[PDB]
Amino acid sequence: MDTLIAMKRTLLELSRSSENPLTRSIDTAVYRRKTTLRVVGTRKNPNCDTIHVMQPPHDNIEDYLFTYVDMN
Amino acid sequence: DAAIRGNDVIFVLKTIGVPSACRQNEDPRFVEAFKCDELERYIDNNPECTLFESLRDEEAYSIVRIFMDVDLDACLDEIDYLTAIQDFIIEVSNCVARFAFTECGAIHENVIKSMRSNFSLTKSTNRDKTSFHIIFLDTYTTMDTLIAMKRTLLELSRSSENPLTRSIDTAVYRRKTTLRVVGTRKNPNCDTIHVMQPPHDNIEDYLFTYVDMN
Amino acid sequence: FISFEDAIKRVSKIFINSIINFNDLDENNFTTVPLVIDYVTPCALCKKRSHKHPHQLSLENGAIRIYKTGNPHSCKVKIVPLDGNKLFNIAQRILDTNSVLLTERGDHIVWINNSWKFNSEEPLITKLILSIRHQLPKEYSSELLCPRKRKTVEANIRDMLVDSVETDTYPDKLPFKNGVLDLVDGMFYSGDDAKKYTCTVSTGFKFDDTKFVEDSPEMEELMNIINDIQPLTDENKKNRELYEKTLSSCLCGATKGCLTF
Amino acid sequence: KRSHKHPHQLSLENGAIRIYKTGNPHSCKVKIVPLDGNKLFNIAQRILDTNSVLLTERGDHIVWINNSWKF
Numbered sequence: 001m002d003t004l005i006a007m008k009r010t011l012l013e014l015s016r017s018s019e020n021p022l023t024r025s026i027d028t029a030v031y032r033r034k035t036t037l038r039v040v041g042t043r044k045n046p047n048c049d050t051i052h053v054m055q056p057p058h059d060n061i062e063d064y065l066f067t068y069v070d071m072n
Numbered sequence: 073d074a075a076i077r078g079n080d081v082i083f084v085l086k087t088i089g090v091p092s093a094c095r096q097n098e099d100p101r102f103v104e105a106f107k108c109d110e111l112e113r114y115i116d117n118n119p120e121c122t123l124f125e126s127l128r129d130e131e132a133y134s135i136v137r138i139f140m141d142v143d144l145d146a147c148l149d150e151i152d153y154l155t156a157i158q159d160f161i162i163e164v165s166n167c168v169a170r171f172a173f174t175e176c177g178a179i180h181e182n183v184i185k186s187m188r189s190n191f192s193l194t195k196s197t198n199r200d201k202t203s204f205h206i207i208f209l210d211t212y213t214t215m216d217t218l219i220a221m222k223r224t225l226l227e228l229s230r231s232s233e234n235p236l237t238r239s240i241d242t243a244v245y246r247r248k249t250t251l252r253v254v255g256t257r258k259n260p261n262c263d264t265i266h267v268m269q270p271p272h273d274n275i276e277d278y279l280f281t282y283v284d285m286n
Numbered sequence: 287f288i289s290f291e292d293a294i295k296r297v298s299k300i301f302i303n304s305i306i307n308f309n310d311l312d313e314n315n316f317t318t319v320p321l322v323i324d325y326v327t328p329c330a331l332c333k334k335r336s337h338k339h340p341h342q343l344s345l346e347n348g349a350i351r352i353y354k355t356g357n358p359h360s361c362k363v364k365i366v367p368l369d370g371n372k373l374f375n376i377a378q379r380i381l382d383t384n385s386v387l388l389t390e391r392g393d394h395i396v397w398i399n400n401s402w403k404f405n406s407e408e409p410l411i412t413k414l415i416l417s418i419r420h421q422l423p424k425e426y427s428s429e430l431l432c433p434r435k436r437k438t439v440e441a442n443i444r445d446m447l448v449d450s451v452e453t454d455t456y457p458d459k460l461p462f463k464n465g466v467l468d469l470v471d472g473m474f475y476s477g478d479d480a481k482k483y484t485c486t487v488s489t490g491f492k493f494d495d496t497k498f499v500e501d502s503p504e505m506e507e508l509m510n511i512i513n514d515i516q517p518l519t520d521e522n523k524k525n526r527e528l529y530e531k532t533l534s535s536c537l538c539g540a541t542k543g544c545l546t547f
Numbered sequence: 548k549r550s551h552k553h554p555h556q557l558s559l560e561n562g563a564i565r566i567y568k569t570g571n572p573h574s575c576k577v578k579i580v581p582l583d584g585n586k587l588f589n590i591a592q593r594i595l596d597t598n599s600v601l602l603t604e605r606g607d608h609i610v611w612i613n614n615s616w617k618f
């Protein structure tokens with residue numbers, strides 16, 4: 001974990017330096033204590049109708065979970 | 073135009089919320105017309121008096137100096153204050169010169185030189201606030217010009233980022249404007265006043281109706 | 287203004303550290319609850335270390351001001367706007383400087399290096415934008431180092447110019463590459479003083495007062511040539527009186543109604 | 548001014564070098580120098596300082612390569 005909280009300055013300075021189009025639209029404060037990430041297919045609120053659209057070639061649930069660790 | 077006509081009498085009020093009819097009646101208890109020296113004597117002998125400066129009749133003589141007010145609810149160190157005031161001066165000069173060239177048909181360089189040559193600043197006795205009135209000595213214009221330029225000033229205040237520039241209040245440019253006299257008590261139960269500036273040790277450099285075209 | 291979530295986004299990018307009370311900010315109480323951040327890296331406002339008091343946010347003039355409770359000098363004051371684009375503001379400032387103008391011929395004249403220049407096939411506007419970055423605040427100068435942002439600012443400036451202006455209206459001023467001299471007084475204006483007279487042409491050689499001396503050996507030998515060409519004789523004085531009339535007529539920039547042989 | 552009797556001083560803040568006169572700061576002017584920029588702009592500045600590319604009066608660019616000037 002504690003690595004993620006230390007590169008935040010590094011990626012923010014890279015985004016400020018690099019002028020690639022989508023690089024200007026990254027998030028830095030996401031790396032924090034007790035970080036919460038939205039699961040695919042789960043809405044933020046019932047009022048909101050925005051859901052995550054599944055993208056091939058990965059279809060399984062473990063393909064989109066950073067809390068799962070496997071050794072291959 | 074005016075040429076020989078140069079304002080030297082100073083119109084001064086004594087209390088906010090002056091009754092309407094008594095202004096035309098010119099009651100001595102609220103309206104006074106002085107000169108520089110006797111006004112200085114009147115503010116020296118009475119330290120608890122409250123004085124407010126304003127014009128009497130703009131229908132015949134409505135030419136005044138350029139004046140602006142700034143007030144921010146924070147404290148700044150000397151160096152940051154100097155940097156902010158320099159950038160503020162540059163930006164305000166550019167904006168005013170651009171407006172004058174675009175609408176009034178004046179000359180950009182003359183306006184910039186006149187407004188950046190001489191200007192008078194004040195300070196507030198409060199420690200936790202940064203407020204001042206700025207007077208441009210060598211620039212003269214009509215009140216309607218200030219009314220028209222109010223919108224551009226508001227746009228500049230909204231667009232900018234300097235803390236001093238964001239604090240400009242454009243509400244002072246309206247019909248029957250009033251200003252606080254420097255070194256004068258504001259409220260009967262308030263000790264906050266304005267002080268002098270070492271560049272300018274004369275009272276006549278801190279009035280926006282005293283006109284003298286050199 | 288803008289979306290509240292974007293305001294929290296910008297505020298959280300400003301604070302390099304994370305806050306603990308993130309869930310406690312709402313649309314109606316963000317100006318009251320104190321703000322305490324996690325302490326692993328010194329705050330971006332002031333270096334210091336481990337600020338001992340919470341911060342606070344205030345809303346004024348369509349902007350958010352961040353101030354630290356306690357010692358005013360402990361942490362630096364920061365103002366975050368929520369209204370417009372930075373490039374538009376930069377273009378507005380550049381226009382306010384009054385350095386690029388539109389002529390009736392459809393070309394743009396630019397004040398670069400104490401002179402007015404215009405090109406019908408080259409974008410001098412980008413060069414002006416790059417050159418003028420020294421007269422702008424710190425936060426604006428960094429954005430002008432990227433060519434794409436310069437092109438965007440140029441597009442905004444080109445969109446902003448609607449009216450045209452006249453040029454070369456004073457026939458009594460002689461322009462140079464370093465300034466303009468007045469024919470009625472002989473005084474030479476350089477730099478910003480020459481910006482008043484919109485002259486788009488120049489002699490091509492810079493002015494220099496060192497050679498502009500009457501008491502010089504080079505001047506003395508010129509009367510010999512002028513007497514050889516035009517003898518100072520009475521019967522020719524009328525011709526002499528005419529000879530200087532045409533010769534001095536070349537300086538001005540007004541239309542002449544006569545032909546000379 | 549005359550000889551600036553009080554010595555000057557340097558500071559660094561938000562990626563900028565600030566120069567200010569000690570003693571009475573109001574007797575001088577505070578100057579700012581940005582010690583930051585793009586890498587590509589720095590490369591272009593170095594190449595320009597090498598003085599290998601020039602502009603002609605006819606609108607053409609001349610470069611210096613292989614010990615020769617070419618346009």
Ligand SMILES: Nc1ncnc2c1ncn2[C@@H]1O[C@H](COP(=O)(O)OP(=O)(O)OP(=O)(O)O)[C@@H](O)[C@H]1O
Pocket residue numbers: 027029030032037038044291295298304308309
């Ligand atoms: N405690 C927090 N610290 C930092 N940022 C936070 C915190 N809580 C929420 N946010 C931010 O608030 C926003 C809320 O998520 P939003 O729906 O806007 O986008 P997202 O992060 O792309 O979504 P998702 O939840 O699908 O990953 C995000 O930008 C998130 O980083």
Ligand SMILES: [Zn+2]
Pocket residue numbers: 329330331332333334337360361362
């Ligand atoms: Zn701090």
